[PDB]
Design an enzyme around this catalytic site. Structure first.
Site, PDB file in Angstrom:
ATOM      1  N   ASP B  13       0.812  -1.213   0.000  1.00 45.48           N
ATOM      2  CA  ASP B  13       0.000   0.000   0.000  1.00 45.48           C
ATOM      3  C   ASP B  13       0.848   1.266   0.000  1.00 45.48           C
ATOM      4  O   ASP B  13       0.409   2.301  -0.516  1.00 45.48           O
ATOM      5  CB  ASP B  13      -0.943  -0.021   1.202  1.00 45.48           C
ATOM      6  CG  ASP B  13      -1.745   1.251   1.336  1.00 45.48           C
ATOM      7  OD1 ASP B  13      -1.461   2.028   2.271  1.00 45.48           O
ATOM      8  OD2 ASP B  13      -2.657   1.471   0.510  1.00 45.48           O
ATOM      9  N   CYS B  82       9.607  -2.619  -7.278  1.00 42.62           N
ATOM     10  CA  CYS B  82      10.078  -2.451  -8.645  1.00 42.62           C
ATOM     11  C   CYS B  82      11.591  -2.509  -8.799  1.00 42.62           C
ATOM     12  O   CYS B  82      12.073  -2.554  -9.937  1.00 42.62           O
ATOM     13  CB  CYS B  82       9.579  -1.112  -9.207  1.00 42.62           C
ATOM     14  SG  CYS B  82      10.126   0.336  -8.271  1.00 42.62           S
ATOM     15  N   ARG B 256       8.722   5.866  -4.887  1.00 42.41           N
ATOM     16  CA  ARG B 256       8.130   4.594  -5.279  1.00 42.41           C
ATOM     17  C   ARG B 256       6.610   4.609  -5.208  1.00 42.41           C
ATOM     18  O   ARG B 256       5.984   3.546  -5.289  1.00 42.41           O
ATOM     19  CB  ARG B 256       8.684   3.462  -4.409  1.00 42.41           C
ATOM     20  CG  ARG B 256       8.354   3.595  -2.930  1.00 42.41           C
ATOM     21  CD  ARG B 256       9.322   2.789  -2.077  1.00 42.41           C
ATOM     22  NE  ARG B 256       8.895   2.716  -0.682  1.00 42.41           N
ATOM     23  CZ  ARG B 256       9.656   2.265   0.310  1.00 42.41           C
ATOM     24  NH1 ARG B 256      10.890   1.843   0.066  1.00 42.41           N
ATOM     25  NH2 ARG B 256       9.182   2.235   1.549  1.00 42.41           N
ATOM     26  N   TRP B 258       2.561   6.013  -6.285  1.00 42.05           N
ATOM     27  CA  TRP B 258       1.786   6.289  -7.482  1.00 42.05           C
ATOM     28  C   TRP B 258       1.598   7.793  -7.637  1.00 42.05           C
ATOM     29  O   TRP B 258       1.485   8.527  -6.650  1.00 42.05           O
ATOM     30  CB  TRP B 258       0.413   5.617  -7.422  1.00 42.05           C
ATOM     31  CG  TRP B 258       0.426   4.122  -7.501  1.00 42.05           C
ATOM     32  CD1 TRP B 258       1.341   3.339  -8.143  1.00 42.05           C
ATOM     33  CD2 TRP B 258      -0.537   3.228  -6.929  1.00 42.05           C
ATOM     34  NE1 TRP B 258       1.012   2.013  -7.999  1.00 42.05           N
ATOM     35  CE2 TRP B 258      -0.137   1.918  -7.257  1.00 42.05           C
ATOM     36  CE3 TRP B 258      -1.694   3.409  -6.166  1.00 42.05           C
ATOM     37  CZ2 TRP B 258      -0.854   0.794  -6.850  1.00 42.05           C
ATOM     38  CZ3 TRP B 258      -2.405   2.291  -5.763  1.00 42.05           C
ATOM     39  CH2 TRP B 258      -1.983   1.002  -6.105  1.00 42.05           C
TER      40      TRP B 258
END
Ligand code: SAH
Ligand code: SAH
Lengths: 191, 277, 277, 197
Positions: B13, B82, B256, B258
C-alpha cells in the site's frame, strides 16, 4: 472424492508438466500402450484456453529438473507455472469430479523457495527419501492431494541432512511412482 | 441493488495513495485493509487518515482464512516492488527472485479474493508496475493475471515522466486520460516562492537522488524540496511531513509511490458503483 | 493623525515570528527589515511570507546611514542570542564576550532608529531574552535599555515552559496574560493522531535533543515530531517544512524561537496606532 | 563643528572623566584651578541618566581602559560599552546646541575584535599615538574623539603587528597610564573654554 466401482472406471487423463511420467504410469496400469497423456515442458505461452482445449484432466503432475541437471530456470519458475496451469485445469465448481494434482521437488528449491511453494500449494511438503545402508542417498519433496501421500513422510530426514545431500550432488521417478497407487480406485487398470 | 461502502484490499500500500484517492473522489470507504511493512510508510497512512486503515503487515503472512474473514472485498489493488524488475538496476534479479517474486503474492491473493462462481457481484482489481522491464517478465505477469496492461504516463497529468503498466478490470481503463486544470502539468506550477523551473517536465523520479538540479533560485542551482516533490506526485503538501522524516526518507516514499492524478483517473468510474457523498 | 501601515526593524529575526504575528493580527506592514544570518532561518521567512521581508545580514554591518534610509521605523524588535547568557551552559561567555555582546548592537541600533525629540510620532520597541541569566547581566541590560523587563511565561498560553524577559515600551506590556480558546494549553492538544501525552506541560525547549521521551504511541515511548513542536510553539503546522530541513535543523530553529501566542499578546495593542484591515 | 567662543565669556570646562582620572593632566594645561569642576567615577554599573544630569552639565566626557599590564576586573569591552552609554546621558539635547566634546582612549587593552566594536559604536577609526625613543616603540594608545585636531596626530608608521607585539611583552612583564600621549590632544579646546594662568 468417494471411490468408484470397478465397472465405471475410465482411463485417467493426465497433464505432465516439465518432466514426463508417461512410462511410470504405464507400468502401474494407468495408461494403455499405444494417448491419454499431454506432456508439455515450456508452458511460458500456455493460456487457460490451451489447458481447456486439451481434454479435461484428472491428474496434473509437475516436477522440477533432477538435482544434478544444471537448470534452465530459476527453481521457483516450475512452482509458479505449475500453480497457474493447475488452476486452469481444475474443474469448475458447478461439476465436482475426481481431480488430483502433484508437484515434486528433487532438492532443487532453495530454503526460501520452499515456504512460498507450501503457501501456494497450501500444504507442507512430504519427504520421500532413498536410504540404503542407513545413510540417505537421495530424496524428493512432493505436494499433492493424492489420498495416501502424507503418511509416506519420513520424519527421520531433517532439513540439514537434506541440504547436505543437495550440496554433495536422472530423475528418481522411483521415489514418486508408488504414490499414484491410491488412484487405481478412481481410474481404469490396464493389464 | 443498493450502494454500500466500498471494501478495499490494498497490497503493497505504501503511503495510502489508494485510500487518499478514493476519499478525494467522495467514495465511502467501509474497509481498507493495507498490507505494508515499511514503518514510516505506515505512519503516514495512520496519521493522514486517522486510523481508518487496517494494517496487516507482510503480504506473505496473509492466509486464505485471512482473506475470507477480512473480506468480502470489492476492490483489490497493488503495486509490488520495482527495484528487481527495472532496467535501472544492473543487479536486477528478475521477476522470479529478489523482490520481483512478490508479484505472485498479489496474483495468489487476487484469486483468493475473487468472488465465487454463481456470485457475480461487482469485483474490481488493479495491479501496477514499471514499464521498464524485460519483455519476458511483462508477458509473464500478463500470463498470470490473464490480461494485458494499459500504459499510462503521468506526464499527461503530472509535471514529471512516469510511465507505468496497469493491469486490471476497472471500468474505462482504456479511455483516454484528459487532465483537469487543477492538475499541475508543468514543473513551475509545483515550485515554492522565488524558484524557477529549468524544465517543464522533470525526468522520472525514483527512490534516490543537470536534471538532478532542475531548479534555479537566486541565480544558482538547487534540488527539489520535499513539498515540491509532493505536488509533482499530486499529493497534498506536507503529506509526508510525518514522524521526523527528512529529505532522504520522504523521497524514498514518494519515489516509489503512485502519481495520484493517474490513480484518480483510473478509480473515478468507481463512483457509480458504491455509496458516495 | 491618520493610522498608516507599520514599519518594523527586526534584529535577530529568526523564523520571522514578528512578521507572522503582525500579519496574523490583521496589521498592515509597510516595511519589514530583518537582520538574520542563518540561511535556513532566512529560507523559511522568504517563502512562508513570499518575499515581503527585506533581509539584511549581520546586524553589525548595519550603519547609521542604513537606518536612516531603510527607515523611518515604527517598531524595533529583537531577541539576541542566548547561549552565552544562559546559566546552565557551563561555557557561557557572559554579556560582554561571545554572542552575548550582540545585545549592544540592538541597543546601538535602537537609538539610531529612535525618533528625534522634536518628532513625537509613535515609536515602539521590544527586546527579549532569557530569564536564566546572571543578575549582573539582567541588570546591565536594563541599564542600557533604561527600563526593567516584564516576565511572561509561555506556559500560560502554550503547552510548554518558556520564561523570558521582555524589555520595551509596547502598550499594555504589564497587563495580565489570558489565554484564548484557540490556544493549545496542554501537550495532548498538540499531538498527532494516536499519541498520548504523559505530561500536560513539557519543559522548556532548546536547540538540543524521561522528559526526552514525553509521548507514548502504541505502548512504546517516542519523541515529538516537528509538526507537534510547531504546535507547542504556536506556529502554523508545517511552518518549518522548508528547504529539505530535517529533524535537527527544524528543532534548532524552533528551539530558539519565540512562543508566538506570547508575542501576539504583546503585539495585539498595536492595532490602534497602525492601519489594519 | 562648533563655533569660536570669545575670551571674555569663555567659561571653565565641566569634565566627566570615567575609569581613569585626568585632573592632574587637565589642570597642568590650565583647564582647571586648585580649589570641583570635574566629576570622577570608575564604577558606572549603577549610574543612570539622571545621575549624569545631576553631576552635569558637562562639556567634555573622558574615558579610558586600565593601563597596559594591569589586568582589569572588567572585560575590556565593558569600558567601551559603558563609555558609550553614559556619553549619551551627557550629550546636549539637539534643541540646545553648545560646545560638547568627548574622548575614549585604549592603552592596547582591547583585542582585535573589540576594536571593530569600539570603532563602530564611536563612528570613527582609532588614532595611534605612539611613544617612540631611539627609533623604537616604547608605548602607544588608541584614541577615539571628536576633538578638532585629533586625527592629524596619527602615526601611520606604527603597524598593527608592531602594536600587538608591544602589548605582548609589556603585559608579560606586568606600568601605569602614560598620560603624556593624550595631554596635547586637549589643547585645541582652549579656544572654547577658559584658560587659567
Ligand atoms: N513483503 C512485503 N509485504 C508487504 N509490503 C511490502 C513488502 N515488501 C515491500 N513492501 C512495500 O510495498 C511497497 C511497494 S512501492 C508501492 C507503493 C504504493 N503503490 C504507493 O503508492 O505508495 C513499498 O512501500 C514496500 O514498503
Ligand atoms: N551576527 C548576527 N546578525 C544577525 N543575526 C544573528 C547574528 N548572530 C546570530 N543571529 C541570529 O539571531 C537569532 C537569535 S534567536 C532569535 C530567534 C527569533 N527571535 C525567532 O522568534 O525565531 C538566531 O536565529 C541567529 O541566527
Amino acid at each position: 472424492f468417494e471411490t468408484v466401482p470397478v465397472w465405471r472406471r475410465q482411463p485417467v487423463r493426465v497433464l505432465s508438466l516439465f518432466e514426463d511420467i508417461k512410462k511410470e504410469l504405464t507400468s502401474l496400469g494407468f495408461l494403455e500402450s499405444g494417448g491419454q497423456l499431454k506432456h508439455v515442458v515450456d508452458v511460458t505461452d500456455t493460456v487457460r484456453k490451451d489447458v481447456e482445449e486439451w481434454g479435461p484432466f484428472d491428474l496434473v503432475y509437475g516436477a522440477t529438473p533432477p538435482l544434478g541437471h544444471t537448470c534452465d530456470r530459476p527453481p521457483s519458475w516450475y512452482l509458479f507455472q505449475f500453480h497457474r496451469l493447475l488452476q486452469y485445469a481444475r474443474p469448475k465448481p458447478g461439476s465436482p469430479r475426481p481431480f488430483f494434482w502433484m508437484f515434486v521437488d528433487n532438492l532443487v528449491l532453495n530454503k526460501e523457495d520452499l515456504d512460498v511453494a507450501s503457501r501456494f500449494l497450501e500444504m507442507e511438503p512430504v519427504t520421500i527419501p532413498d536410504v540404503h545402508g542407513g545413510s540417505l542417498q537421495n530424496a524428493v519433496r512432493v505436494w499433492s492431494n493424492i489420498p495416501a501421500i502424507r503418511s509416506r513422510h519420513w520424519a527421520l530426514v531433517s532439513e540439514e541432512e537434506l541440504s547436505l545431500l543437495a550440496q554433495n550432488k536422472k530423475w528418481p521417478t522411483k521415489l514418486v511412482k508408488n504414490c499414484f497407487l491410491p488412484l487405481r480406485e478412481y481410474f481404469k487398470y490396464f493389464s | 441493488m443498493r450502494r454500500r461502502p466500498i471494501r478495499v484490499l490494498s497490497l503493497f500500500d505504501g503511503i495510502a495513495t489508494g485510500y487518499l484517492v478514493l476519499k478525494e473522489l467522495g467514495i465511502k470507504v467501509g474497509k481498507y485493509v493495507a498490507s505494508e511493512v515499511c514503518e514510516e510508510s505506515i505512519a503516514v497512512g495512520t496519521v493522514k487518515h486517522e486510523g481508518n486503515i487496517k494494517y496487516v503487515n507482510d503480504v506473505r503472512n496473509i492466509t486464505k482464512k485471512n482473506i475470507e474473514e477480512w473480506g468480502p472485498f470489492d476492490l483489490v489493488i497493488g503495486g509490488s516492488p520495482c527495484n528487481d524488475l527495472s532496467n535501472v538496476n544492473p543487479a536486477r534479479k528478475g521477476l522470479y527472485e529478489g523482490t520481483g517474486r512478490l508479484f505472485f503474492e498479489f496474483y495468489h491473493l487476487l484469486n483468493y479474493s475473487r468472488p465465487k462462481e454463481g456470485d457475480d457481484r461487482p469485483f474490481f482489481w488493479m495491479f501496477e508496475n514499471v514499464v521498464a522491464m524485460k519483455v519476458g517478465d511483462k508477458r509473464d505477469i500478463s500470463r498470470f493475471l490473464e490480461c494485458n496492461p494499459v500504459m499510462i504516463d503521468a506526464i499527461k497529468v503530472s509535471a514529471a515522466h512516469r510511465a507505468r503498466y496497469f493491469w486490471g478490470n476497472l471500468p474505462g481503463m482504456n479511455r483516454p486520460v484528459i487532465a483537469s486544470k487543477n492538475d499541475k502539468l508543468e514543473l513551475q506550477d509545483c515550485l515554492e516562492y522565488n524558484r524557477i523551473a529549468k524544465l517543464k517536465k522533470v525526468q522520472t523520479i525514483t527512490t534516490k537522488s543537470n536534471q538532478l538540479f532542475p531548479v534555479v533560485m537566486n541565480g544558482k542551482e538547487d534540488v527539489l524540496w520535499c513539498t515540491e516533490l509532493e505536488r509533482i506526485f499530486g499529493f497534498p503538501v506536507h503529506y509526508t511531513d510525518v514522524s521526523n522524516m527528512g529529505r532522504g526518507a520522504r523521497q524514498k516514499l514518494l519515489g516509489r509511490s503512485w502519481s495520484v492524478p493517474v490513480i484518480r483517473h483510473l478509480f473515478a468510474p468507481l463512483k457509480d458503483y458504491f455509496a458516495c457523498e
